[PDB]
Nucleic acid binder design. Structure first.
Ligand SMILES: Nc1nc2c(ncn2[C@H]2C[C@H](O)[C@@H](COP(=O)(O)OP(=O)(O)OP(=O)(O)O)O2)c(=O)[nH]1
Ligand SMILES: [Mg+2]
Ligand code: NA
Ligand code: NA
Ligand code: NA
Length: 325
DNA sequence: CCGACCACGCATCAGC
DNA sequence: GCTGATGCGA
DNA sequence: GTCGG
């Protein structure tokens, strides 16, 4: 908000590189810059000043001067004025449709919300669901609905086996008053790094949420990851709640912290920490934190009793979810 | 100044 | 089937 | 796009 104008500009650009130019690096570069800029406590007044920041090279400084000078950016005005791109970008907003398929479709003549439904026969199951709920998914979730959802999930879980521990991470755990979707970390004593003493541990919980009619659709589903859709039950004659994206990740309970850390994010906060990690000599991931060998091979996983333990290894002052972004 | 740039589960496809 | 890579969304 | 080997 302080540097909002800027970070929005950088954001839109980043999206154009990921969705059109299909260049994640330029995508990240732009994100990283917007990320460090959003953290900058001063109201920027030039590209010279901005560049001093890591992640802001000359190019971005140049655009910052233009924007600050004209209240806009020609490059962004052009892209916005080009139908092809605007259709591609548009298409990627459907769950299941990334840069690649979106482009193909604009090539195959499909480029409007109308075209898509008229060619459902071109979409796979997932992309199909992303289309059906397209409108619903564009919506952010009120923190109160989140709660009503967290409540339902934790109950049904207990109803399957009280050894299960379910935790809502993502932007929720970070204290957001709204969320894009719902991220659920799961754990059970019967599954650790040493062994899996039960079959269908994730399945028992998924099916339970469906039997109860909370889970409506399944984007994809393995033995540790579930991507689907759900909806809060609504009261008679009351417009129903938008369907929402929901993920449930089953982690070995002895790794609960690395995984909760990962799943709490943000994604950007994560990449940073992981970057810092490597700089301290470590390699982090939802599972463990291992020291790196000369060859580049990770050593045995180091013991962790808390998220802070992970920050300690990297020599970072603990940060409650609330300060991660 | 060229090249690397977090980490991974699930779906699918090419080569075998 | 498997490996390795693409694609997708984390 | 950056910045570091
Ligand atoms: N390390 C790493 N973690 C990621 C990446 N993308 C997402 N994540 C983690 C942190 C997230 O906070 C969780 C899933 O996150 P989301 O995309 O739902 O982010 P988040 O809930 O923070 O935003 P939201 O309010 O739901 O729109 O996976 C990534 O590229 N790298
Ligand atoms: Mg989320
Ligand atoms: Na800089
Ligand atoms: Na999409
Ligand atoms: Na999600």
């Amino acid at each position: 908000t302080l540097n909002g104008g800027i970070t929005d500009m950088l954001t839109e650009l980043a999206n154009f590189e990921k969705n059109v130019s299909q260049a994640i690096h330029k995508y990240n570069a732009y994100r990283k810059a917007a990320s460090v800029i959003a953290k900058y406590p001063h109201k920027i007044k030039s590209g010279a000043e901005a560049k001093k920041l890591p992640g802001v090279g000359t190019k971005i400084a140049e655009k910052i001067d233009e924007f600050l000078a004209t209240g806009k950016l020609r490059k962004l005005e052009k892209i916005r004025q080009d139908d092809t791109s605007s259709s591609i970008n548009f298409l990627t907003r459907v769950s299941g449709i990334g840069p690649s398929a979106a482009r193909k479709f604009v090539d195959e003549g499909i480029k409007t919300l109308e075209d898509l439904r008229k060619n459902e026969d071109k979409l796979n199951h997932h992309q199909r669901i992303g289309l059906k709920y397209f409108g619903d998914f564009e919506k952010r979730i009120p923190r109160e609905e989140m709660l009503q959802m967290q409540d339902i999930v934790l109950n049904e879980v207990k109803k399957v086996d009280s050894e299960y521990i379910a935790t809502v991470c993502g932007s929720f755990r970070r204290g957001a008053e709204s969320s894009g979707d719902m991220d659920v970390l799961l754990t059970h004593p019967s599954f650790t790094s040493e062994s899996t003493k039960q079959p269908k541990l994730l399945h028992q919980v998924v099916e339970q949420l469906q039997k109860v009619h909370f889970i409506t659709d399944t984007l994809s589903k393995g033995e540790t990851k579930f991507m689907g859709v759900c909806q809060l039950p609504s009261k008679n004659d009351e417009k129903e709640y938008p369907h929402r994206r929901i993920d449930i990740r089953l982690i070995p309970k002895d790794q609960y912290y690395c995984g909760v850390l990962y799943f709490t994010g943000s994604d950007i906060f994560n990449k940073n920490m992981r970057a810092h990690a490597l700089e301290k000599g470590f390699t982090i991931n939802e599972y463990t934190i291992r020291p790196l060998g000369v060859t580049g091979v990770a050593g045995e996983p180091l013991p962790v009793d808390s998220e802070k333990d992970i920050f300690d290894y990297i020599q970072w002052k603990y940060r409650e979810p609330k300060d991660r972004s």
